[PDB]
Design an enzyme around this catalytic site. Structure first.
Site, PDB file in Angstrom:
ATOM      1  NE  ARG A   1      -2.414  -1.570   3.644  1.00 49.37           N
ATOM      2  CZ  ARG A   1      -1.725  -2.515   4.291  1.00 49.37           C
ATOM      3  NH1 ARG A   1      -1.334  -3.621   3.684  1.00 49.37           N
ATOM      4  NH2 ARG A   1      -1.459  -2.360   5.587  1.00 49.37           N
ATOM      5  CG  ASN A   2       3.103   4.282  -2.438  1.00 51.62           C
ATOM      6  OD1 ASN A   2       2.736   5.364  -2.892  1.00 51.62           O
ATOM      7  ND2 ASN A   2       4.343   3.830  -2.588  1.00 51.62           N
ATOM      8  CB  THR A   3       3.194   1.434   3.898  1.00 49.08           C
ATOM      9  OG1 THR A   3       1.763   1.352   3.773  1.00 49.08           O
ATOM     10  CG2 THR A   3       3.558   1.815   5.339  1.00 49.08           C
ATOM     11  CB  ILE A   4       7.253   5.631   3.480  1.00 52.02           C
ATOM     12  CG1 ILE A   4       6.265   6.696   3.972  1.00 52.02           C
ATOM     13  CG2 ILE A   4       7.340   5.575   1.947  1.00 52.02           C
ATOM     14  CD1 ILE A   4       6.682   8.146   3.645  1.00 52.02           C
TER      15      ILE A   4
ATOM     16  CG  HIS B   1       4.390  10.831  10.381  1.00 50.38           C
ATOM     17  ND1 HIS B   1       3.604  11.868   9.917  1.00 50.38           N
ATOM     18  CD2 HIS B   1       3.597   9.724  10.394  1.00 50.38           C
ATOM     19  CE1 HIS B   1       2.381  11.417   9.677  1.00 50.38           C
ATOM     20  NE2 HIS B   1       2.345  10.117   9.953  1.00 50.38           N
ATOM     21  CD  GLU B   2       5.060   6.135  10.954  1.00 48.24           C
ATOM     22  OE1 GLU B   2       4.892   6.468   9.746  1.00 48.24           O
ATOM     23  OE2 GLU B   2       4.129   5.862  11.722  1.00 48.24           O
TER      24      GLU B   2
ATOM     25  CG  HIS C   1       1.232   8.083  14.136  1.00 49.84           C
ATOM     26  ND1 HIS C   1       0.054   8.806  14.125  1.00 49.84           N
ATOM     27  CD2 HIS C   1       1.546   7.850  12.845  1.00 49.84           C
ATOM     28  CE1 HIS C   1      -0.327   8.990  12.872  1.00 49.84           C
ATOM     29  NE2 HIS C   1       0.557   8.417  12.074  1.00 49.84           N
TER      30      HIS C   1
ATOM     31  CG  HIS D   1      -2.423  11.689   9.796  1.00 47.88           C
ATOM     32  ND1 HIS D   1      -2.926  10.856   8.822  1.00 47.88           N
ATOM     33  CD2 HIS D   1      -1.236  11.160  10.185  1.00 47.88           C
ATOM     34  CE1 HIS D   1      -2.074   9.868   8.623  1.00 47.88           C
ATOM     35  NE2 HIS D   1      -1.037  10.024   9.434  1.00 47.88           N
TER      36      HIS D   1
ATOM     37  CB  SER E   1       1.469  16.622   6.682  1.00 49.52           C
ATOM     38  OG  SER E   1       0.700  16.590   5.478  1.00 49.52           O
TER      39      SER E   1
END
Length: 201
Positions: A105-108, A142-143, A146, A152, A166
């Protein structure tokens, strides 16, 4: 400062695929991980959180868990191994797995929300998805966000368009946390206030 002093001692694990990607060069990898941590530390400076690298583990022989396409699944396996193995090697507050895996799922990047300090859930998985150190470091941040209880950014709650939380990363990505993020962190310190980040190294 808007926030009281906190400390996050990080463990960073570089998997075998990433080790191979960087020519099986431990020193090159260590330099890159340090540059990432220095960026995470800078990004958390306005939250008054001192970020240290407590432990660096490079899987130079083979992967100790199955680093698969589904990031959430990989994060669960990584959390298990972190609790059973990594925490027994050296205490730390949060661990991130860096990999070159082309996550589904195009996850980074992916992490559990609001579970900082938890023995199994204070983890994130991050794809080394750019040659630009900052782009990977802001994904790690970012992680971490979370894991510190941030969701977000939402335009009705705050106006920053390119801040760390974002909903989608961008080429113009900022190194700043939005007011949405700062407010989530205040909520987290007020309601959860996990003890491990109160302890300085």
């Amino acid at each position: 400062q808007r926030f009281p002093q906190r400390y996050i001692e990080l463990a960073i694990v570089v998997d075998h695929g990433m080790y191979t990607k960087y020519s099986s060069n431990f020193k090159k990898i260590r330099k890159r991980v340090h540059q990432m941590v220095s960026n995470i530390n800078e990004m958390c400076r306005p939250l008054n959180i001192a970020i240290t690298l407590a432990l660096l583990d490079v899987w130079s022989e083979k992967d100790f868990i199955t680093v698969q396409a589904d990031a959430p699944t990989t994060a669960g396996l990584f959390g298990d191994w972190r609790e059973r193995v990594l925490l027994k090697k050296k205490n730390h507050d949060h661990a991130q797995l860096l990999t070159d895996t082309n996550f589904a799922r195009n996850t980074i990047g992916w992490a559990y929300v609001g579970r900082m300090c938890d023995e199994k859930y204070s983890v994130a998985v991050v794809k080394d998805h750019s040659s630009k150190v900052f782009m990977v470091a802001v994904t790690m941040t970012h992680e971490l966000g979370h894991n510190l209880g941030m969701e977000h950014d939402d335009k009705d709650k705050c106006k920053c368009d390119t801040c760390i939380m974002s909903a989608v990363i961008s080429d113009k990505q900022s190194k700043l946390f939005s007011d949405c993020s700062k407010d989530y962190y205040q909520t987290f310190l007020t309601n959860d206030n996990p003890q491990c980040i109160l302890n300085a190294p």
